[PDB]
Design a protein around this ligand. Structure first.
Ligand SMILES: N[C@@H](C(=O)N1CCC[C@H]1C(=O)NCc1cccc(Cl)c1)C(c1ccccc1)c1ccccc1
Ligand code: NA
Ligand code: NA
Lengths: 27, 250, 9
């Protein structure tokens, strides 16, 4: 149900320092 | 992890440390997939060429960690094992095919800011994300080079095309594995290494913004060698066995 | 290298 949603990031709408590197590669 | 960086607090809250009771030492990485099930590499528990065959009572699971060596009072949680389940067709003899194992915990672990399960992929997430060039993330407390880190390390690595994986190695590769890392021409580098074994290769779904564990740190030739890649257990391809185990004994 | 863990576990 809530797997994969980190309390300290996704649950707060905070991004970690390099997750955008992953997004940008999903082309 | 080679050429990675320190994890942020709470960045990988499914991260699990497999810890040897006596002597007290790291054994492997692993991941939290629910309040009582931990996922790891079979070779973390069973590898007869190295005289490794662990039983439940030999081990502890440490969850919520950041520091490698420190006891992280009020944050980490330590659990004992009720039962280990290894893939019946795990091939330790040749190539680590189906390098996967589950561990059932004696007691449920309490989720917290530092402790939270990762998702396991369904077929459509797997088909969308496991593409050459797509990057995943692998985390661990293993060697920094082919000493040891003070805290959890992180590195993001691109999946590599199957022909390139096969051509990089003399090992017989299977459909139950994928490889990842940069090519020598790509500049950037990084890799898993000794002690990262069993830890998770995760990807963040751009469809639902959730983290999924697509791989398990499985094997490599040396670490961060030019022209060589890390090899990961293909979690989706072995999901039926995972479901089967959990459905039957959970 | 490792700090010892509480006796309980
Ligand atoms: N170096 C071996 C290996 O990776 N093993 C031995 C069993 C434990 C596993 C291991 O050390 N995994 C940790 C690790 C290190 C670096 C990157 C990753 Cl992703 C993971 C590997 C291998 C051995 C000789 C020649 C080429 C490849 C292997 C492969 C299959 C079967 C036997 C040996
Ligand atoms: Na080859
Ligand atoms: Na390499």
């Amino acid at each position: 149900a809530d797997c994969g949603l980190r309390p300290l990031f996704e649950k707060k709408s905070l991004e970690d320092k390099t997750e955008r590197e992953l997004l940008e590669s999903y082309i | 992890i080679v050429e990675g960086s320190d994890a942020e607090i709470g960045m990988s809250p499914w991260q699990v440390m497999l810890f040897r009771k006596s002597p007290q030492e790291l054994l492997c990485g692993a991941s939290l997939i629910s309040d009582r099930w931990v996922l790891t590499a079979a070779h973390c528990l069973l590898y007869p060429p190295w005289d490794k065959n662990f039983t439940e009572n030999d081990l502890l699971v440490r969850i919520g960690k950041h520091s490698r060596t420190r006891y992280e009072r009020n944050i980490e949680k330590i659990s004992m094992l009720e039962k280990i389940y290894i893939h019946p067709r795990y091939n330790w003899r040749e190539n680590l095919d189906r390098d996967i194992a589950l561990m059932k915990l004696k007691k449920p672990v309490a989720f917290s800011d530092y402790i939270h399960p990762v998702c396991l992929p369904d077929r459509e997430t797997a088909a969308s994300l496991l593409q050459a060039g797509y990057k995943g993330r692998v985390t661990g407390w293993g060697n920094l080079k082919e000493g040891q880190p003070s805290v959890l390390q992180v590195v993001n690595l691109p999946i590599v095309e199957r022909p390139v994986c096969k051509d990089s190695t003399r090992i017989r590769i299977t459909d139950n594995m994928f490889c990842a890392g940069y090519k020598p021409d790509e500049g950037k580098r990084g890799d898993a290494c000794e002690g990262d074994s069993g830890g998770p290769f995760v990807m963040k779904s751009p469809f639902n913004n959730r983290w999924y564990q697509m791989g398990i740190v499985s094997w490599g030739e040396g670490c961060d060698r030019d022209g060589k890649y890390g090899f990961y257990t293909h979690v989706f391809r072995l999901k039926k066995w995972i479901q089967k185990v959990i459905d039957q004994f959970g | 290298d490792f700090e010892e863990i509480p006796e309980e576990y």
